[PDB]
Amino acid sequence: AASLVGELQAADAEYQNLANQEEARFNEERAQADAARQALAQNEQVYNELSQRAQRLQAEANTRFYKSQYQELASKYEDALKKLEAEMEQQKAVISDFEKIQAL
């Protein structure tokens, strides 16, 4: 009847797990944010070069023997460049989303 000592000692156990659980989640969400910052940095490089590449092929294509081909390539890169931009924004959301938590 007065053994609310169980209720209090139960809440205490929960309170420890919760705190721990709460940290593993912050750390895990940070761990991913730091990973996404990396993958993005890499991707941005590849994309930065592939942008100048594709852009060049498009210009040169006009004054090139295999013009027709030159444009097909330029396009094939264009297609990859888009896929890349996607992955990149996705990584950008992960990052801002986490840096939006540090705010709290």
d(CA 44, CA 39): 8
**Amino acid letter, residue 67:** K
Experimental method: X-ray
d(CA 6, CA 13): 10
d(CA 44, CA 89): 11
- Domain residue spans of the chain: 1-104
Q: Which residue has the tokens 């709460």?
A: 22
Asked if 80 contacts 50 with a C-beta cutoff of 8 angstroms, the reply is yes
Span 1-104: which CATH code?
A: 1.10.287.1700
How many Cβ atoms from other residues are within 10 Å of residue 97's Cβ? 13
Six-digit token pair at 72?
A: 């097909």
DSSP string for residues in the chain:
---HHHHHHHHHHHHHHHHHHHHHHHHHHHHHHHHHHHHHHHHHHHHHHHHHHHHHHHHHGGGSTTHHHHHHHHHHHHHHHHHHHHHHHHHHHHHHHHHHHHT-
